Amino acid sequence: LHSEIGRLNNQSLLWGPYRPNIYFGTRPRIGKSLMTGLMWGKIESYTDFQHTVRYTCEQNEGMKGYGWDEYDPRRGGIQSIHDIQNGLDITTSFVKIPGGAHGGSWAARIKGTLNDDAPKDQKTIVVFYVSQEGENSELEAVPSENEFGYEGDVILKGRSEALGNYKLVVTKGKGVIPQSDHDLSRLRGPGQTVVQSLTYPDEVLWQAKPILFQQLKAGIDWLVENKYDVADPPPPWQVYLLANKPGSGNVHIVQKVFEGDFEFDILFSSESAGKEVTSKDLEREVKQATEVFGERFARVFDLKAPFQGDNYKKFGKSMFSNLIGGIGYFYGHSLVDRSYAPEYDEENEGFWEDAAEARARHQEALEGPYELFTSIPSRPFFPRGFLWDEGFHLLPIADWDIDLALEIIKSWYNLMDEDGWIAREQILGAEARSKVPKEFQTQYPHYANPPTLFLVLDNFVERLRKLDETLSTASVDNPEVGLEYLRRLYPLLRRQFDWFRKTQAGDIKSYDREAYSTKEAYRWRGRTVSHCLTSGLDDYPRPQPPHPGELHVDLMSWVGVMVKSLISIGSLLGATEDVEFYTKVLDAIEHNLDDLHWSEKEGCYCDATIDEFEEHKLVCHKGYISLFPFLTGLLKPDSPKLGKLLALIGDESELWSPYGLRSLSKKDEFYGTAENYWRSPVWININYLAIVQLYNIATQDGPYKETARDLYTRLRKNIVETVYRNWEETGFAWEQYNPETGKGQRTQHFTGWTSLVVKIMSGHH
Ligand SMILES: O=[N+]([O-])c1cc(N2CCOCC2)ccc1NCc1cccc(CN2C[C@H](O)[C@@H](O)[C@H](O)[C@H]2CO)c1
Ligand SMILES: *[C@@H]1O[C@H](CO)[C@@H](O)[C@H](O)[C@H]1NC(C)=O
């Protein structure tokens, strides 16, 4: 049955718009196969199209916004693009039609509506770019009956091992198609849909923009050669209309020009399915997917007071649909320093200078290829896998579709090397590398990231204890299937645990360090004078200078989270030897959190170093780090330490702003200094952890139940309304929020863990 659910999840999830780095495109979960991409731009002059054309996601003054209004990767979705520069409101509706043996069929409608400001007769160029990688696959444009291009539909006929036989149709579309009475029309036609069919080596097919412009430039070179000149120039839209040359190749460019409003359809028909897809199919399936999205949303994300209103519901659907709509399929080589240079052990003072010298040897090499199926923080800015972000992304996704969440976790754990390392940042293939400066591509096998993916597995275990609709819950509805998933994953989870203890070890023994345990102490590798990027809290102030004796209380808490998950999953699997080892470790972390990281003087947890005089010194910077044992749920609800942390959380003069908890206390000397990234702003991911833990305490007998209930109620309200007000005014989820003003700041489209807000609204954790 596990096998069967496997095959059905593959077939369900194979096709999608799994190219979140571009406005609209499709690819299957196959490395070397069929990819599609949409381009558009106004053309008003001989030189503006190069500057107006849209392909890869950006955010600037020229784009009002964009995002998914609805999405489910099994069914499809509707995306809205609001383009100020090109005067266009675009709708891309995508829908999946199951059948046959090759992951089924799909359809998309592209709709462009000129905004009020645009000239009514604006000319818009639209390109549908189709590419196919694979040594023994084929794709052919069926020629038109007509001389110069297509009056109707364009038909591509294709074959591969992976997809079988298929046809891809770009429909004629609705809208005015401009006509040229110029002399050139004798040789290029008056104006019509055109197709150019090309071949390049498989590894450059992704470079859609340069491949297009190279064809456009050949077109213009031909005009200059053939006496079309400034005495009598063709109109700009005809100078930029490719000469029709359909045929066979691994690239197919389908170009249309519209005057005013336009729409056209893309119909992908898997031959192994029944009848080929029609525009009527598309319209029907789009209606259906919308009804299904509506029904699932009211079940899965039932928003509780005071967020029951339609305005909060619209907000929730937008925050949710952008998070799940960010799911991409990435394939290619990763850049990795496999030197394991000894400078990376960081056992000396000044270790960051040694580590710099090792990096400057540039021993990194490309390795893989690898594949990843994952949600992303940011389409325009960070369209790739981030290890601790994904833990946050999958909490709402797992509610919606636990089986999808488990596929993504599986995809992440298939990246783990023999040692138990997954790169914190997954830059797979040249297309992914193009969005990243060379200096920042290289991953390091000694750099960890919080294991937030365990928090999702915790939600799954609690659920496992206590056809699309069926597939979505098959791994909890069939406990046999769920246990078997954990059985295969468990060894990887245990390998990572051991990797953390081996590679991120703190030094107790070699200093005057008293503690209940000689084993349990941890230090994030990879820290520089002003940063600790591996912790995920880039510039939170840490002990100065960095030191091999440093201990980080957040890292110990994360190991705590891991052991509690391994106890749970080990138990379900009856790994009794293993569960006994974990239990001793958990008891040891509970004691050493206190002996090594608790400040009675400050009333909070702190990182440690060793002094100028080689003694253990606590270093207290009141903020998120200080709360970590509480945030990761390691503290008993009756703990006096917890009560002191609730006093810090609630204190307006330290962390409590009207807009949520400040990353750093207003009292801390590093408040609003340097880049001020994690040194004051309100971050939705850590606020979410705090809201879940306050709720935990509010729903138990104990001495802080009522303090927790009050703080839970207000914190939930402050975080949701801050993100809501900003979405209302700007159309964006933001990366962080200003604790003085409430404004969203840094990066837009952060869906992204800011989308945790859908879960905070639905409550009942
Ligand atoms: O140096 N940069 O290439 C760079 C460029 C830009 N630009 C691009 C063009 O213009 C607009 C903004 C912005 C920031 C950076 N900073 C470093 C950076 C690298 C990768 C991800 C993140 C975001 N998160 C940071 C979180 O702290 C972490 O926890 C989380 O895991 C991670 C993923 O969400 C930050
Ligand atoms: C989907 O299934 C095929 C064959 O059953 C397999 O090769 C592939 O690995 C599966 N998915 C992924 C991305 O592994």
Features:
765 residues; alpha+beta; Beta-galactosidase, Chain A, domain 5; 14-stranded antiparallel sheet; two-stranded antiparallel ribbon; 26 strands; elongated; binds ligand WQU; binds 2-acetamido-2-deoxy-beta-D-glucopyranose; Glyco_hydro_63N; hydrolase; EC 3.2.1.106
3D architecture notes:
With 765 residues, this protein is of the alpha+beta class. Among the domains are: 231 residues, Glycosyl hydrolase family 63, N-terminal domain (Beta-galactosidase, Chain A, domain 5, Distorted Sandwich); 111 residues, no CATH class; 126 residues, no CATH class. The protein has 22 helices and 26 strands. Strands 1, 2, 3, 4, 5, 6, 7, 8, 9, 10, 11, 12, 13 and 14 form a 14-stranded antiparallel beta sheet that branches. Strand 23 and strand 24 form a beta hairpin. The chain is elongated and about 90 Å long. The two termini are 30 Å apart.
